[PDB]
Amino acid sequence: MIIVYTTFPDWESAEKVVKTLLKERLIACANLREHRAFYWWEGKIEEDKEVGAILKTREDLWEELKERIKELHPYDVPAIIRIDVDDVNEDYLKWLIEETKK
Amino acid sequence: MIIVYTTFPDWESAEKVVKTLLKERLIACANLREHRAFYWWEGKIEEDKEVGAILKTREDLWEELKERIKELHPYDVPAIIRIDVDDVNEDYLKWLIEETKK
Amino acid sequence: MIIVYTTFPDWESAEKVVKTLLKERLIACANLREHRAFYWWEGKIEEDKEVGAILKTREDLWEELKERIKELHPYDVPAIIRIDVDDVNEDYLKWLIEETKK
Ligand SMILES: [Cl-]
Ligand SMILES: [Cl-]
Ligand SMILES: [Cl-]
Ligand SMILES: [Cl-]
Ligand code: NA
C-alpha cells in the first residue's frame, strides 16, 4: 500500500476533496490535521495555515488518485507526495484493498 | 531505523499502548497528535477524531512490535504502518539503539 | 525528493530554524505542527509538547541540510530523519528543485 500526503488551504476544501476521493473509492481513508507552512513563492517566503491530509490507498491506484487530486485541488501547484509502505499488518491491508475501487 | 504509524480512537488508549511499548522497550519514543479521520466502514463514510501516533524504533524489532500492537490495540482492525528511514543523524540513531531492548 | 522530519522544543526555535533553512534555500518549504512526545527521561516515561517539522527538499541537499540543522538545532541530540519520496506530481517537483540551492 501507499500513503499520499497533500495539503489544503482550509478545512472546507480539504473535507470536500477527501470525501469525493472516498466516494469514488480512490482511497480507504484520510487523516486531516492543521499545520503552519513556510514556503518559497516567487521570490518571497510565504507563511500560511493549511490542513494537511494523509491519504491511504493501494499502490496501483497512485496514478489515478494523483490525477483526480490535480483536477479537484484548489491549489494550482499542490503537493501530492507518495510514500510507499514497506509493510503493514495484513488484516488492515485487506480492509483497505476491499474498500478501494477495483 | 523505521517509523511506525498507527491511529487510536482516543488519547486514553493511545497513551496506554504507547507507554506499554516504551516500558517493554519496543520503541525509543513516540509523537502523538490529533487528527480528523474519514474512512469507509461497512457501507458508510465514518468521520471521527483520532490520535495519530508516530513511533520510532529499530528495523529488527518490527515483527515483534507489530504483533505486540495487534494485541494491545482497541481497534479490531488497526493500522500498523511501517516506513523505513532512509537515513538519520548518527547521534540520534545511537540514542535510539541504546533506548530499545537488546 | 525527500522529506526530513525533526522536532523542536517550542515554536520560537522551530520557526527561526526553518526560516533560516529557507533563506539559505536548503529546503523549498516546511509544515509545522504541535504534538506530544513520549520518551524515557530520568528513569521514567516523560511527556513533552514539541513542534514537529516536515521539511521538503532535494535528495542531493540531504548531507548539507543535515549538517546545517545540527548547527542550528536547540536540542543536543535532535531527530533528523530522512524519508525518500517514492513519487510526486512533477509540476510540484519542478517547483521544488527550482527553489532550492544548486
Ligand atoms: Cl497495495
Ligand atoms: Cl503528521
Ligand atoms: Cl550524522
Ligand atoms: Cl504530475
Ligand atoms: Na521508503
UniProtKB/Swiss-Prot annotation, chains A, B, C:
Location in or out of the cell: Cytoplasm
Gene of this entry: cutA
Biological role stated in the UniProt entry: Involved in resistance toward heavy metals.
NCBIfam families reported in the protein's UniProt record: dival_cat_tol_CutA
Signal peptide: none
Keyword tags: Copper, Cytoplasm, Metal-binding
GO cellular component: cytoplasm
Residues binding Cu cation, per UniProt: D48
InterPro entries per UniProt: CutA_tolerance, Ion_tolerance_CutA, N-reg_PII-like_a/b, N-reg_PII/ATP_PRibTrfase_C
Name of the protein this chain belongs to: Divalent-cation tolerance protein CutA
Principal subcellular localization: cytoplasm
PANTHER family, A to Z: DIVALENT CATION TOLERANCE CUTA-RELATED, FI09726P
